[model samples]
Each structure stands twice: as C-alpha cells, then as structure tokens.
Target: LTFTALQQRLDSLMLRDRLRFSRRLHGVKKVKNPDAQQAIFQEMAKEIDQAAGKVLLREAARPEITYPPVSQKKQDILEAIRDHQVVIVAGETGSGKTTQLPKICMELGRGIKGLIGHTQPRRLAARTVANRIAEELKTEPGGCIGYKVRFSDHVSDNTMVKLMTDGILLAEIQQDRLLMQYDTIIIDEAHERSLNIDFLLGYLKELLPRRPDLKIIITSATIDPERFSRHFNNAPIIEVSGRTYPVEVRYRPIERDQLQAIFDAVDELSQESHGDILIFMSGEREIRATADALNKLNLRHTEILPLYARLSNSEQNRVFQSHSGRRIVLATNVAGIKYVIDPGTARISRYSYRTKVQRLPIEPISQASANQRKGRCGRVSEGICIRLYSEDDFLSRPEFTDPEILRTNLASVILQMTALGLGDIAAFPFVEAPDKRNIQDGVRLLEELGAITTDYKLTPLGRQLSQLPVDPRLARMVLEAQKHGCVREAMIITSALSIQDPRERPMDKQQASDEKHRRFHDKESDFLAFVNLWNYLGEQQKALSSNAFRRLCRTDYLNYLRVREWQDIYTQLRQVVKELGIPVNSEPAEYREIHIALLTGLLSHIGMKDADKQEYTGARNARFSIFPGSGLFKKPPKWVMVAELVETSRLWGRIAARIDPEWVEPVAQHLIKRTYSEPHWERAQGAVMATEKVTVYGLPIVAARKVNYSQIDPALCRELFIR
Candidate 1:
C-alpha cells in the first residue's frame, strides 16, 4: 500500500477534525447554571468529541501506512532512538516525516507513560500536523493527538501526542523545568532557525545528560540536518525522500527595471497560466507598490492581495485565500502561483546598538530562500520561478539569513533569560552570542525603562514587568498609568501601539487617509489620537451591526476588523494588569493626565525644538525631523516628544505632539542632570527660581522656577555631573 492511500485518509481525518472544531469548554462540571448558552455549545462539543473518539479508537483496519518515511526509514528511526538519546531526520517537503515519525514513536511504546511532544514554528502548522498524525493513527483528533498554541489548546489528560508552537514550549520552561509531561519530544521544522528554536536546542543540550530517559528527535525539511547533528554530538541521521512534482526554474533578470519586468512577466504569464500568482518582492514598500501597479491594470478575474508583518489580525489572514479563482498576492513571503518572480531583494529589519534604533533595509535573499520561493509556485504541478537576478549573483548571496539575535535588540531576550532564571546574559548558552557591548547596552536600556536601578538591581516594578509579556517600554507605560490613575487610557494606547496601526494609509489614498485620521488626531499627541480613534470607533461599533461598523471603518480609512481586535487585546491586557494588582477602574481621565502617562514611556524619547534653527533634537544630542506625514508636521513648539524613529530616505521622527518640557523632569528624574551653568536664577520668597538646562536622553530640556538647592537630595547631585 502506498502512502497515497494513507494521504487520502489523512485528508478525510483532517476534514473531520475541522468539522469537530469548537473552542467552547465542555462538561465544565457544569459551572452550576453558568451562562446557560454554554450548555448548548458544551453539549455540541461533547457530541463532536465522542464522535471523534469512536472513529479514532476503532483503529484503521488496514496495513501499516506505507509513507516513504514509514516504509523506508521507520525502522531505522526506531532503532536509532532505541540506541541513542537523540536522532536527526532530514526529509524533503512531502516526505511524510512530520506525520509518520510520531506514529513511529508511538509504535515504540514511547507515549504510553507520558505524552509525545511535537513543536512547530507556527500555530496553524502545529494544529494541522497534529491532526494529520492523529488520523494516521486512527485516534480521535484532539483526543490522543492534540495541539496547543498561544491562545488556544485542544489537549486533555487522556491525550498522548501533543503538538504546540515553539513559543508554547518555551513558556513551558517557566512551569516545568524538565518538561515532565512528555517523555518523547519532536522539534519539527527546526531549520527555520527561529529565536525560540535556537534557545530550545541549546537548553536541551544541557538537559539531555540530566534526563537521559527523555528521547528527542529533530527534523528539518532541508539538507541542513547536519547542523543539528553536530550540535547534538553527531546524533544518528535518517534521510527520507519526498514524492514532489518537478519545478522549472527560470531567471528573468531585470530586462527593464525590476518592478516593470515583474509586472510585464505576470502580465504575459497570467494570459497562459491556470493557477494564481505570488510575487515575492523586497518587503512592504515593494509589496505596496506592486499591488498598486497591478490594481492600475484593472486586471480581470484577479485579486491583488498584500502580505506583511505589520497588519491587523484579520488583515493578516487575507494572505490565505481559500478560493479556486485566480489571484495575485504581493508579498515579502509567497504561495501557489504558476510563476514566481523573485526581485532577489528581501527587506529585513535590524537593530543597531549604536543608534539605539531598528532599521529596515533591502538585502539580497540567500540561495536557500530563493529556492524556497521557487517551490512556492510548483505546488499543483510543474511551475516556473523567475529570478530577477543573474544566476551568478544568486550564488554570491549569503548561505542563510543572519540569526535575529545578532541583528535585533537583545534586551528583550536577555530580560526573558533573567526572568526565567537562565543565568547571566553574556554567559548564557546562545547559539550565537551577542556582543558584550550589546548586552551592556541592553541592560542600559532596561535601566532607562526602570526595570532595574542604575546600580543594577531589579526594582519592584521590574519584578512585575518581567511577569508581563511585553517589551520593557510598554510595561513601563502601564505601570506609570496606574501611578497617575489612568490605566484605562494608558492601556488603550498601549494596545494601539503594540498592535499594527489600526489605520491604513495606502499611498494612493494617502490624502484621504490623512484627512480621516486628522478627525481623531490630537494636536497635543498622536498617542492620545489613538485613544480618540478607539473611543470614537467603540461608540460607532455600539450603534451599528458588525458589518455596518466595518463599512464605517472603510469609510473612515480604519482597519475596523483589526481595531475591534485592538479592543480585544486591550481587554486581555487590562485583565492582566488587574491580575498583577494594578488598578483597573475606568474613569474619565483628564487629557493632560493621559499625555503625562505617555511621558513615562517617551521620556527618553523626549525632544526639544530650536525655533530659530528650526530643528528637533532628542537625548544624547541626537537630532531628527518630525516625519512629513505627521499630524503635527511643521508645527513649532519649544518642547515635543518623539514617538518613533524610522529610516527611509532619512531618519524621521513620527507620531509626535507638542508637550510641556517640565513634563519630562518628574517621571524621568534618573535622566535629569544638574546644569547650573548659565542658569537664569531668581531667588524670590523662600523659593530660589532657576532656569536649568537638564538633559533627558542628553538633548537638553529647559526647566524653570521652584527649587532650593538646600532642599535637593545629595544623591541626585552625584547622579548629575557624571558627564
């Protein structure tokens, strides 16, 4: 029997599993007359779970599935596991390794005592793969085989096979240092080289000697299995072949310009092509432009979709179209187009410790990535992948993309390590250790965040911060809001800031988007402008149908779908703050109070404008311009707070608002330094009035009046003049 027969069953099982999908809780021990509607859904889920159980437990009344991995390498896999603590499986796509290997583990009697743990790089893959394996074993999906991701889980104590996202597994370390729930663990798709995978691999290396009883198997979909084998002291390797259709690789190096050639090729190909199209470009800028150009052609029977990282929850889902009709997707990522056009450039984001900012640049894609893009087109049958670069240029590209830890901010990762009791940041077992200076700079940023003291001890606030799953800065904003009695307002801004901007400003509609945005814009703040958007939308949402509310958002240029999600995240985070014992009351807050709360986060980002010079400067003598697109663009004020700094043609400060300079001093006192030099001092009454030049991030802010040197702290004087 070929795996083709088993693959048919796999799909049937997956279809049944999907039909059984229900997120509602059941048999809740009956929350004793709890929300009566729960009874209906729980009853529905009960029926599905039982139906799933009967079909699954009956077992397949057929021979062992003949997938290539199962037929060719299952015995080797089991034998390797029986002899060693670890095994690495290198299988190409469609090899059935992900599904078949877990069944092999079960056949070896591994999951009887505990669960067989499987981890994937993504949530959807984890769930789908778990269900596929479940069907091959003839067990009820989510009964003996289930998956868990960030917000959802479908496993029970009766379950033996569990698939979860790598993130879910990493968070498990906080609760189970040994991961004692599972006896056999499979880290699937480990070649993706996500941050969590690297940490898990390193940590598990140290763990294996202690838990020699724990059997581990790691799989990669590429020839790169040897890297893991070397990492694990040369673990046994099992290579399995996949049954995949052939792909035709074509190079269409920019005949005209890269963008022009891509469109022309697509224009020519779609006329002859049967399948949809996926165009891989540099990043968001390229994706946006290509989408606009395609829309201009008003191509018939075509849908131009765009995909990127910074989209609302629903907008993110638009990338996956379930249709049989032809569609065109503009992406930094890809899919089942008959022809794949690679501009050769991928816009990747990197953080510079030197600038203390993140930058996005268009860099050449690696050979590995180019091939992956090639595979995206040939899913149904033979398809073409056009490379818009010379063959020689593709080979000259890097072998692999740089690991994020090396390029992005390590502060968050370091702090997570500290909170997880993983030891010194510089001394930890990073697959690639970041620079010591980067670690120092990370800690320095944490200090600026008030997560620690200048002397390097976790503040009480820092302890609370480590408990919340957010960047240090956002956590600080929430804490500061509680202090100022505006947790409600602060969290709204926090959610808006953390999630993608709820407003879409497509370049073609740039003017209208800005005009609609201005209706909610606060002259004093783009941050508070978010609060206004949320509030106004919340009111509209209350008055209209969900669909009607969506139309209103379309009219207003808001991502109504995601803004609703913005509200959901706010509810989730608000509950988290309340659980942490911060005040959660929603009261009408003064406009001044909300901006002051925001200052706690933006204090380091504080800026001062020189009216005569017509310039904006931030801390440490840093200089930037209010982004030309800002609501406060070209507005003059002695004091302004820079919201975010982005790099395009140049460094631009975005989402800024006019602020009182004195607002900078109180929340950010640690940053305050004494500058008695050139002080305009006036001693009136018992108060010695002085205009002192105190720097927030090193760019000076002017503070005046109400001080007596005799009343100042001796320690504060030392905090200053360290310069």
Candidate 2:
C-alpha cells in the first residue's frame, strides 16, 4: 500500500497547478525537494512567527564557551555512526550530540556533498543551535549552517548543517518522500515524542530500508537506547555525558487546592537567595492566578512575575537585568530556574470525535509528562521538585504518554499524505495506530467541509486548503470569505484566532478591563468584536486621530503590541493570498452576511436547540454554554455556531453567532440524509411533517420533525439560501 501517484499526476497534467488536480507535480518519483519550493517550502512558520514576534531570542545563549560533543571521545561516536545506517545518541541536554554531531557529518565529507538535514523540537532551539554551529564553523548562517521553521527560513543551497523545527521537516514529507536532499538526517530531540517527532521516527523506520544511503541519527537527553536500538533493529547507541553541577532532588507531595499548594511551595523554597524559582502550571490562567497571589503578598524580599502572560520583548529584557532578589516565574508550559513546583496538571489538547471539536482540557500529567516536568526542574545540577501528586499516582500512570497522533484528529495528516501521493494512511506505519474511530471522524469531517469526496478523493477546495499553512477549517473559511467579498475581516478573524489573546482581564483587574472592552463589544458576535477593535484602531492609527491609543490600550487593559502583531499576521496572510492568486473584492458585507461566509467552514460545528433540556447542544453530544467572556453569552439564540470549544470550568463555546435554522437546509444539502419512516396518511390538512430526519453538526437529533413543509415558501427559502 506504500506508493506514490507521481506517474498518474504527470500523465495528463493539463492545467496549471494552481487549479490542477496536483499541486506537487508527479513524475518518475525521484527523491528530491520539488524545484525551489523545497527551499522556500518551510518559510510559512518563519513568516507566522516573525509576524507574531514569536521567534525572538529568549535564551540569550552565550555561545557555549566550548562545545563538548566535538571535544570528547565522540570519535567513537562518529565512527559508530559512519558504520551503521541508524544510530541512537543519548546525551545530557547541553551535551555534544546536538552541537557537535552535525559537524561530525561535515568532517566525514557528507555535509559538503549533500544537504545535511537536522531537526530541532523548538524554534528558539533550532535558530540558536544553528547560530552556535555557524559560529563554530566560522561561516555565515545561510552559507554553511541554517535553520527553518514554519514561516521563517534562513538557508542556502550550500547549507550542510540544516537546522529545522520537526514540523518543518514533517511538512517536507509532503514533497519529498525519501528526503533525498539531505545526505544525513539528525532528529535532535526524539525523546520529546511530539506528534511530528513520532511520525518522523515511524516514517523513517519504513524509509530506512528504501534508502540505505540515508544516514539517520536520533538524539535525546534521556533516550532509552535499548528501546530505540531494538526498534531500529538494534541501532548502535552512543551516550554522551555532559559536565554540570550535581543536583539534589526531594519531593514533597502537596495535599491541598492549587492556590494553597502554590503558596506551600513558596513557603518551603522562597528564601532570600539569588537562586531563581520556577513553577509549572496547567496554563496561562493558573500561572496568572498564582502570580497575582504572589505579587499581592508583601514578600518584600522576592520579586515575582508570570512567565507566560503579556510580557513584551522589552519586559523580558528588563527581567533579565542584573538585579538582586529571589525571583519566581510561573511558566512556557517553561521549566528553568533552580527550583520547580509541579502542579501535576497540564492543559492537554485532544480532539473529541464525539464533539467534532478540539478540546484543551486541563488534565493530570502522565508519567512521561512528569518526566518532562522534571526536565524543567533540576535545570542545573542542584535542584528541588515538589510533585503535588503521590508517587503511587505517578507509577499508576503509563510508562509514556500516548503520542499526539493516537490522541488527535488525523484529517490533516491523511490529506497531507494523499497530497504527497503517499498511499492509504491507515496502512502508513504510525508508531502507534490511532483510534480507528478518530480517523473515521476526521475523514468524515474533511468530507463535510468539502475538502474531500465521500469516497475520499481530493477536491479542488482541499488542494487550496492544504496550501494555507493553517487548520483546514480556517483555511476553508479564508477561501469562502474571498469569494463572498469578506476577505479582510475574515483574514483578521483567522489571524486573531491563531495568535495569542490580546485581552488582559486578570481576576484582579476584571471590572476595569470589562468597562473598557465594552466600547468595541459587538453583542451579536465576539469574532466581530475583535474585528471592531482592530478595524477601529487601524483606521484611527493611520489618521493620527488617536495619538494616545497605546496609552489608551494600556488603560483599557489590552495588549496593544499583540493587536499590532495581529495586523502583521493579516498582512503576511494577504501577501500569501495574493501569491495564491485568489482575487479580492472591496465590496463590504452585512453583519450576518459576514457570518454566513465564515459559516460554510463551520457547518459541522452548528449547534441545535434543546428547549426541553434548556440548553444548546453541539454535535448533539454535549450541551455547551456560551463562554461568559463572549458578547452573546447572556442572550444566546435558539440556533447558533461557535469558533472555539474550550473546556475550562465547563464546555464553553466562544465567539458564537446566531443563525437561521433554515440556512442549514441548503448549505449542507449534499450531506442531508433523508431517512424516511414509512409515511402514514394523515387526516388533518394542516398537519406538518418534516420530510427529512433533522440533523445538525453531524448529530442526529430527531428522526422526524413537523415544520409546515408546504408553506416553506420559495421566496423565504430562496432568500435564506442565497445569503
């Protein structure tokens, strides 16, 4: 089942790829990056991060005085790698494997001849590591060493030590199967077990026999050489010991609520010392809450700050200033400092097949998560960890957390595989096979969005959606908005949804924040509320009508910088859309009309009224309330749709919109399944019976329904469908 459709795509390639059945043209399937697209292939991440200001250097890594990887008996490491096709390198975090191995490839005459591809887990890690290696090589970044992430890339054809985010490398699989561009492939953080890393390992497992010339190396901090060695049929394992101070570990399991537990950690460790304090919580809310509590306390000796919230680049720089006080940081979801207090909870992402929505629910950390939780602690040799959960609970957890592929929606992966001409995804060798049910739901969802046929064939819409470097739903929304002449607002909405939140309403500042936010609040749509905020500010900004808007934003409790970045992302998106050749329209749309344009992409998320239950049921599985932060929360409509379904205190849908029930009839007409019960002849002339079983959001709510079928007049239905 493993194959490529290269021959088929090239045989009758009659149209431009913009409108072709194939975006990546097919051919005699040589393993290579497609034209220069490979070079520019991964710049999407760079652009996005650059626009969002997410790629700035935070680690301020003073170039590793001397890289120990090349300094040690790593010659044994180099020789073992040269002799074996696959090698597992186990080393400590700042050890030689990451900084020196790429050079080892260069020294062996491998990097100079062909591209030496390397993968990193994080953006900062990728860029900084490249810079470190480049400085060592005495060469410029894009000349000999380079790095690439989603929207940013700094690499040249001569690049041998190619540093990249694992995501960039995974996306490359859609173009080059064997990845023939690189002479050696180094997966730098295999132990991270991220979705992309797991997939790459599984893929490389299958790709190994196909290309024996491909030299593959997997590197990690706590790599289980035996497990990976056996997985790759006993690949030779080389362990690199890093030189660092000795660390002390003693766990004090907390037995109280979160707020109390945090203070308990502080009471135990918050001494008047220079050692920085780090705490890991589930998400921003928890971090903000704890930080607020700490900041309010008269800890006159300690300076506390949340590592996760509205800190600008300058703010971070100020924190890094030479100061003398005990420091406390809340988190990345980040574990540094000399001491760590683990809450044993993380905001984990999992796609619910039942709800057809991605849910970020705060859940207990797995043993594997705890292992990573430890990595953030003990950053130095001497460290302390307060595991809130009992050791019994720790061992009860699985040895490793399930890789994301097993727990996530598989639609995008399936589509990417098909587009790349990889055969049947079900047959694709995933390290762990995903839930068959999730796969079915994913495919069904893709089909509902018109990205694929019922039979699983690609549609023109799917091809375009695949190119946008966003979620398929958001991508489709962009396309439909363009056709409906609502591109600008839609682009703003899409970018707004993708980046960090601009609103800063901490519990301590809630009332003041709400008073200012009311100025831009659109009662009917939270999505439009964001539109209003940006559009109003953007216009005023250009006109110089509001010179004090930045001050106003601070007074209003908004992140003015984040809002500007939203505009930056929209600018990048517009450039991408223009490059995509999608024609634009200046004609404006009405309030609900704009909603209709966005609705096409979210039809699968449409909610239904359960008047008897006195709730709105989405996906017919969960009854959700409108998020309290949304404008429509108090006065929600009978029929509606939402942009996000996040599980915090409860299942809450945000950015909701009211919709006419009849609009569903035509919008999803192709998906409408009319399972008719045997019609019984009725006596009453005015008695109404629904001809179809009423279903919305893919949920079969009622088998039959009454609706005065005949009186559903043409003009009303016509107007409804036309919009």
Best-fitting candidate, measured by TM-score? 1
For all candidates in order, the CA lDDT equals: 0.68, 0.66
Task: Return the TM-score for candidate 2, rounded to 2 decimals.
Answer: 0.59
Please, what are the lDDT tens digits per residue for candidate 1 over residues 1-723? 222332333322222243224222323334465566454554554555565454455243222433433466777787888888889887775647888887787777666555788988866677667766766666674466777876445468567778898878887886777776777889987876766787788778877876766899998777477778888888988888765578777666661234568767786677667577778754354466567767776877778888755456577555554767877777755224666777777545456443354434446878887877776763557777778788889888988877766765666666666556555766656666778876776787787877776443567777777665445666677888887778888888777765557788887898898878888876667787888877887788679854466567778887643565566567667667877988865777886777787777676677777766467777767777777767677566777776576667766677777778667777777767756532122445443233456666676565554355435544554444353
TM-score of each: 0.62, 0.59
* Residues forming the 10-long window of minimal summed lDDT in candidate 1: 11-20
lDDT (Cα, tens digit) per residue for candidate 2, span 1-723: 112333232332211221222333222134465554444433432333342231122112112223433366567877988799998888764455688888777666566434678998766567667877787767765576777865455467556678888878877776667776676899877776676786788788888887766799988866464666777877988887654444444556662243676776677775533477777765554455467668776686677776633355456545455656677877756333677777776645565544444434446777766766565544545666667777787778777655576555678767766665556777776656776766776787688778887454688888877666445666678887875677877887777775556877878888888887788887677778778888777776676523255555666787654655566567656777887888665665677667876777777667776665346787747777777767766776777888877677787777788877666666676577544332322458643333557566555544556554435433444444455
Which regions in candidate 1 have their CA more than 4 angstroms from the true location?
Answer: 1-70, 151-154, 223-225, 242-245, 253-347, 360-363, 377-381, 388-393, 418-423, 452-660, 670-723
